[PDB]
Amino acid sequence: DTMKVINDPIHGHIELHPLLVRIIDTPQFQRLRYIKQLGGGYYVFPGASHNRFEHSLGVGYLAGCLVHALGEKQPELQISERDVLCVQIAGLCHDLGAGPFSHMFDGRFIPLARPEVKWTHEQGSVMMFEHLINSNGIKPVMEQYGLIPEEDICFIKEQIVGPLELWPYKGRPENKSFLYEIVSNKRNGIDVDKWDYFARDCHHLGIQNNFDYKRFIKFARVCEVDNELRICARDKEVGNLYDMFHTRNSLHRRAYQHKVGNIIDTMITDAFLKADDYIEITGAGGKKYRISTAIDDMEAYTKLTDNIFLEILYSTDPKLKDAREILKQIEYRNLFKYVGETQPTGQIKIKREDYESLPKEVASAKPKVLLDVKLKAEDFIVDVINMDYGMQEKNPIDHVSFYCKTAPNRAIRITKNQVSQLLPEKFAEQLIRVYCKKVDRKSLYAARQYFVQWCADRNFTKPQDGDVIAPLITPQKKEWN
Template sequence: AEKRQTKITEDLENVRQKYCLDFSKDIRKASEASKWKEESFMHIIISFCFLLRTVFSRSVSINRFSVLQIFNDPVHGYIELHPLLVQMIDTPQFQRLRYIKQLGTKYLVYPGATHTRFEHSIGVAHLARCLLKTLHENQPELNITKQDSLCVQIAALCHDMGHGPFSHLFDGMFIPEVQPGNIYVVLLKHERASVDMFRCMRKKNGLDKEMERYGLNLPEDIQLFKVNIFSFLQWSMKGRTEDKSFLYEIVANKVNGIDVDKWDYLVRDCYYLGIPCGFDSQRLLKSARVCNVNERKHICFRDKVADNIYGMFHTRYTLHRQALQHKIGYIIDDALVLADDKLSPDRKISDAIDDMLEYTKLTGQRNWVHICYTQMQIWLKPEAFCRTLSTDGCQSLWERPD
């Protein structure tokens, strides 16, 4: 990011030197040829060059601190992200999500289900920003600050950083099976790992200074981030006062389950699976308001979008029935559980949950997938899988022991 900003500064300075100074010389020659007063023209040129320099300098500052970067997403179209979020995306800890399949092993059953936690996380951050913008414009009395918005966007972006290979298979089935007595798994699952990974990302990439540069108060705002990540917690007087308790219902809504995380993964899963999506997330977003319910502020929706909300939960039901509970998917999941001690003679796959640097390297690619296929010979004919997967050394994976 620093190299990119330095390059922008150099380019703008080159433009200023080339055009401002050349333009000044041309005007001087014109003034001499026409016998006009040089002092008047030079005063104009100096003022003009100063103006351009000011504009260029401001453009660097704006690009560095204010301008949202645009990305093209197949689900949401053009989306805008805060530059601080872009810096977080460029870290190894977040780039790891490119290799964590959103639907776990289901891409081995459904050819289109190849999307990852990477694009899902970006989509959730985008929807969080849009929802906060809607609430701020329609209810300015909520006093949603730029820092509030940025904190929630960071939580939305990083909420899934703790997922292991094949997403919920890892923390929901694999780790509980191979480490049944691990308190880490019993209580916290991938949300705990997301907070640990976020801490590792900040430390290894020097992000604390960048966060402070954007006006964040780290001790307080980190609490807001953590509570947003732990979806099993409701507002707990950490990070913000009770009048902003609604901020904790944007990324993961414990009250009613209607949140931007669910909006993105339902629409995205339907898109890549080829299943019709039965609700409009944009309509829900535009109709959201903060209301006082039982002496606390909650995010609510108009009664006229009740059918749309029903469609959202029905879409989730449809996805589980038609795709997420496929029997072949369960067979693959069982094979992965048997692969824990097959990757390395001296270490198990599950050991990585205690070291975030090792966890960063743990994805759903290559070795573990091949081991998975090896285990599948217990249930299925190996020749069928060799036809399914074309990789170097595939035949050696199917050599049965005597």
């Protein structure tokens, strides 16, 4: 069979090898048509209707581009078409574990529904990949195209999830180390996955992207670093790399962590939690699963998509009333009310196990103001957001290797002070958003008082609108004035 050409609004005309086509045309891959890339973000940015499917095509394409470029500039690397196909397949299949509304599912729902389990999106992708391969007879097509299914399937999985557990990989040896930096870069976070979603999300959101992946590809080489051949960027391109991470941060501030988008993800998750006992998804054998248990059976998970939303919204069963009602309130735009935003000060970090107690803290605050209404713990929502450069408190550029034009095969390192003094001094912070479920004027007022008092007691930052929303609280706070 022959190659297919496909037209993508981001990358243009992409060539798809017949093996890739065989992989794409399976229920396991096509399911990605029914999962929105940005989930609840679509309910704030109406252009964001794009799905995981097209993004996956993009990542496969981009993975291919990088490996190809590397190969043509450096034939001594012995990059084979087999290598190219494996990196392409890895890029294509990286997101196969996506659940309903993408990262709402693994980031919000599963942690609340199944706290005992260790679930990652990537593990999901490996399992779903295995299921695709075994359910569609892919191994003989792989062999037909020069792949060796054992090592190569191992390699693809390793590209997606990391080492399956000092060279920890089995799919490829150290002299092909660079191949593991293409799809998901565990070392510094610089990969083609990011490059695709920056561009694609920007295209759909109506926000413009300022990162040029093509330039990066032009300037990329492979050099020896610690007895492995790794990808190195050109030294003077370091500025661009800092900008890339800045871009990432910007996209999170403007879109991915938009206050309303997040509150909508929250409400939908609440609906799924109230629906979990009663929704049935039929997997292997005819066995029944729940939304929270579909992850245990790939045939059921294959059928778990954004559809569940609509299944709940359109239901007539009384047992789903509660869930249904919540979704209906989303349609009427009767959302939880944003009360405010604050940050911790000094060294103070908030841990996830402390998240659960935060609404209790806010309601327990004691403002010295006349309050019509007393508010409870369940009236508040506290969303904690980690904003960083992808490596917690670390500078990812400290984990990038560079080359100089005068000696292109010699890897070097570049420190932050060698670049600019206008760069961040810290690379991680927390944003605390507080919302109130009671929508009346007085409850909202009260909630503002509770919130600002709470910020004052914990020495958090002064809310930007503090002097307007709670003028009796902010002045009696040494700093904030």
